[PDB]
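Hi team,

As requested, here is the filled-out complex form for the zinc ion run. I kept the field names the same as last time so the parser does not choke. Let me know if anything looks off before we queue the next batch.

— J.
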Amino acid sequence: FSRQEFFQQLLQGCLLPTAQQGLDQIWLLLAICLACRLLWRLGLPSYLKHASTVAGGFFSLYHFFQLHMVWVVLLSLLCYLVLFLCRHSSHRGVFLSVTILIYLLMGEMHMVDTVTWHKMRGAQMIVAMKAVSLGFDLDRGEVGTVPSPVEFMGYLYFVGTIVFGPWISFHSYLQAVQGRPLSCRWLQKVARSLALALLCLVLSTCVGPYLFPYFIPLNARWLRAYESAVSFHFSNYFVGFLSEATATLAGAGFTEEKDHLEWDLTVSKPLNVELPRSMVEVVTSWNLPMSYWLNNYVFKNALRLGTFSAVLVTYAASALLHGFSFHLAAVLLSLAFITYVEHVLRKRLARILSACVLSKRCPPDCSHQHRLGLGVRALNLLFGALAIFHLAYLGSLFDVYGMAYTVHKWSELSWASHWVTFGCWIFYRLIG
Amino acid sequence: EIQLQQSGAELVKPGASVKMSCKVSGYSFTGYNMNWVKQSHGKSLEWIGNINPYYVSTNYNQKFTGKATFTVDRSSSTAYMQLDSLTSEDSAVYYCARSYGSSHTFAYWGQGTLVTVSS
Amino acid sequence: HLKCKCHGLAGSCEVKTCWW
Amino acid sequence: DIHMTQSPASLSAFVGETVTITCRTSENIFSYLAWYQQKQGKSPQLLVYNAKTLTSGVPSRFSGSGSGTQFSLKINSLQPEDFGSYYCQHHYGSPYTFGGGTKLEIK
Ligand SMILES: [Zn+2]
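And here is what came back:
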């Protein structure tokens, strides 16, 4: 299977079928998003708009998930029942959260087949995030009154952010229901997001898993780890760009400030996760709306128990949103420990050396002695290489599930990431 | 028969600090937000913020951040507000207002604590 | 041969692109 | 944020007359607008919430209406205990801002 023999058929037999399949599977979702956007411009009553997006969400859920969408429908009905029963309370967040938790647990306890649950994990995660965020917004006082049935439904079934789309606050969805003019900035954002989504899709499917033997003349257990990591990262970037494309096509995802309308919904940042500065930056820039949801709700609610327990329960809730499945809770707990130890070691070195080696670039007001130079840049490059190593190790699980499979993968990778994290923690203990 | 009994009047020198109290009575104190409302002498009402008594998480108006601090004491079921570095413009009446359940309207109000600053 | 890769939200098969 | 322009700033009427107070909003609030009534010296009192829904105890002579950015409160058959100050307040989302106020006086 010579390199030239691979490339002679690469273009056609990989770039055309995968792009064509992406288009054939997302064209109807894009059409329905555009139809809802155009229909929310005629100036119908608000409840008509919410009913329209409810019907659009029903049709989209049916198209993607053939008939197993009854689980998402029952999750929405149950979330509304729990929000209505506790509409006058101040605990709405914890009530909706316990309801969501019990639902996901009873689901994973063989309420539905493993394949269909793996298929609908994303839709149910978005519905759960939306319901819990609305509960906590009503609790804290950032949303005035509880929504009517049709408003709550049209929020959960927003045709833009139902299948792929990110979590958007209830007020973002309300502003979307208001609608904004179909300017040239809007179409520019939608077209650019679709182009980047298709580019990242074809990269993840064609160039990712086949770059180290062919695209680079270099070549192994770590080269394949980096290949799989990059393939999964670019698949997720495709999903993110497509999600923001649909959320901007439906109308949502804008920030109107000072009567200046910028369609600036960003879901992922590929240049911050591929060329990282620190694992905290990777976790932040991987999924930006999901990071905002997690940080804000879970972390601000549980910070009272100390920062370490707060981030631990943050990652626990992150693994629970997905539904308890191995290779997705082990990875997330390893991420918790890695980011914690890395940020702590960065703070300790930036204290003992007063240098600019923090986990995030220092603001201009910091009294650090080494703002620039060679030591700071070399140490930042070292920590970036460690972050790339951790990312490749963790993403090796996505070679192109079973606990035995994960232990096998990490054992054939010799557990080097956990050893490195433990060594960094011991080093922090010895320094401080 | 909900009754949000509030503290007495106050007369402090500028730059000092005051800590009002709104002793609640009539319902489960930790089940409804406690909106704090400021009204000048014959002017419009202004919303300072609200403290959620279940988990103590405040939400301040951007104008009154740093100028107001909400603390609650669920043992005696009284909500407090502190004013830091009082200026001559804070001679107003401050109400405590319970949020009307689902909506965030102010169903039950206190009676007001006349705060006046002078020398 | 043929291999199917499925793309989705944080690991799911909402959309899959198989190829030869 | 959201600004609540309320007119008129003052109003005189008789006993049994019909009056209407308007509260125009600088943004869309989806009919989230409450109406209070502060008498001379007392604390305010919620009369109408959701711009249409009366509360428990307020008589049937009050009736809120409107939606979008132009709301109104119509008080028919003014009784002597209907005279005070009326402050419209949106409950769309934090921060909550009240209106200017309408001093309803007898004459
Ligand atoms: Zn610095």
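Two things worth flagging: Residues A 356, 362, 366, 368, 371 surround zinc ion (CB under 6 Å). Chain A is about 70% helix and 0% strand.

Thanks,
J.
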